Design a binder for this molecule. Structure first.
Ligand SMILES: C[C@H](C(=O)N1CCC[C@H](C(N)=O)C1)c1cn(C)nc1C(F)(F)F
Ligand SMILES: [Zn+2]
Length: 140
């Protein structure tokens, strides 16, 4: 579990969005596994606006932050799960690292701010949904 809190927005994995998130919806994209809801209070996370490929992510299944190298956001085939059929997930970045069901929502960060959140796992790889292209999170 986990979310990004920026301005008047809450960014979560779409597959883990609560009833309250859908009742206060701003934007959602199944192909990226992202959902953004509105908040009453202002958030303080800063979204990275960069092309970094090295960062640190939080892994709840190990209670540890790990430094990683990760790929550029791409359309990657993801195996069928209880949440989606087998499909290409867009804007996804992979790194060599531990992930397991329960780790989605963990933040990946670089020197510039938040890069994205854990969204996939398997075969000793961890996948992060990028948020650096959502420039609108920094406004209105
Ligand atoms: C099966 C699950 C996963 O990748 N997904 C389930 C949830 C929906 C995902 C998607 N975005 O499409 C695919 C997974 C397997 N490992 C080892 N770690 C995970 C994870 F970290 F929980 F994501
Ligand atoms: Zn960066």
């Amino acid at each position: 579990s986990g979310a990004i809190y920026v301005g008047n927005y809450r960014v979560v994995n779409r597959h883990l969005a609560t009833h309250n998130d859908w009742a206060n919806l701003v934007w959602e994209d199944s192909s990226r596994d992202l959902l953004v809801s509105s908040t009453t209070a202002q958030g303080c996370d800063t979204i990275a606006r960069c092309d970094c490929q090295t960062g640190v992510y939080y892994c709840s299944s190990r209670r540890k932050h790990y430094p990683v190298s990760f790929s550029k956001p791409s359309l990657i085939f993801v195996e069928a799960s209880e949440y989606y059929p087998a499909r290409y997930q867009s804007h996804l970045m992979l790194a060599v690292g531990h992930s397991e069901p329960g780790d989605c929502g963990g933040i990946l960060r670089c020197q510039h701010g938040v890069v994205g959140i854990v969204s996939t796992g398997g075969n000793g790889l961890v996948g992060f949904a990028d948020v650096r292209d959502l420039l609108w999170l920094d406004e209105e």
